[PDB]
Amino acid sequence: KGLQGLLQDIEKRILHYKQLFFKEQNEIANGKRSMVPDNSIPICSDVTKLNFQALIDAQMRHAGKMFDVIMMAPPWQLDSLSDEKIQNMPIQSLQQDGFIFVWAINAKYRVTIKMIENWGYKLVDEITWVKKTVNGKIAKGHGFYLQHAKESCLIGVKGDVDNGRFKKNIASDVIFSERRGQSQKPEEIYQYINQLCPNGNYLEIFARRNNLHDNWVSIGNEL
């Protein structure tokens, strides 16, 4: 009856979708390229279990240099890892001259500033992302004191960044763009970083498959 017709329709549907599956797995084994750029270096490991000494040795062997920019979008405790465990990461051994970019929520602004100053950096700049709607309006949110429609990136610095490498008077502090996807930052931060340090060796911590970029070393357990 109705269940028999449903079974016939489900047989037609599996016959239709097997064609799509076989088309996809035949085009995959033919030389199809994904959206991930070729020069991306992704590492899939927990930062609490990753040996950073191997990364230091590999970077010093294959570049004769250290990282220029370290960008972080930490999973704040509200995968919500920790605060002290985020502090304990060996950023000091990961860099000697350049910048750091840490994305901070309003509840972890002070903690991010304290971590940046405890890693040896000095706070010099701040980048804010203002969320947007499809009509070019601010996407109102929620909060305790005021309606939050912002997100902050805090920027430190080490060493002498004026030798010949980093540019000055570039980009902007404000990123006005839509809040697409999940808690995912825009690509304007990557454009601004490439404007700051053209053709550099970057490092991204707590990364996802949308964070994979050219010349970027990306670390993330879901990568």
Binding site: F21, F22, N26, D38, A58, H62
Partner: protein
């Protein structure tokens, strides 16, 4: 200056996992064309071929329990095995134990039939 292509290849060879590179530094784009946790590694394909060689065709539960691990989609095993023989109806081989050479000759016969009757799709005939 620094050549970023060879630098990226060397860094991927040293640091990235086996499923991310192609044992020469080149990016494995099949890994990033699918979702995380479902890749169907060549080791998985060889294990499925060994399972078809050892046990019968259609007994996907034994292959899931032994030849892979404990995590294997029965639907995906059926689909990949159907792609192995080259026909989208794995029914006439139910129960037979098929090795690699006869698997290849069955796939060749199926692809020749598909090309000779002009009713062929991508590595499946029509069934």
């Amino acid at each position: 200056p620094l050549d970023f292509t060879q630098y990226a290849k060397n860094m991927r060879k040293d640091l990235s996992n086996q499923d991310i590179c192609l044992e020469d530094g080149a990016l494995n784009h099949s890994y990033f064309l699918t979702k995380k946790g479902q890749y169907w590694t060549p080791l998985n394909q060889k294990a499925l071929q060994r399972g078809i060689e050892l046990f019968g065709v259609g007994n996907w539960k034994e292959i899931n329990y032994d030849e892979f691990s404990g995590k294997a989609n029965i639907v995906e095993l059926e689909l990949r095995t159907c792609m192995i023989l080259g026909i989208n109806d794995i029914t006439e081989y139910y129960g037979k134990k098929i090795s690699e050479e006869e698997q290849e000759e069955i796939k060749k016969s199926n692809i020749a039939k598909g090309k000779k009757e002009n009713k062929l799709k991508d590595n499946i005939y029509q069934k």
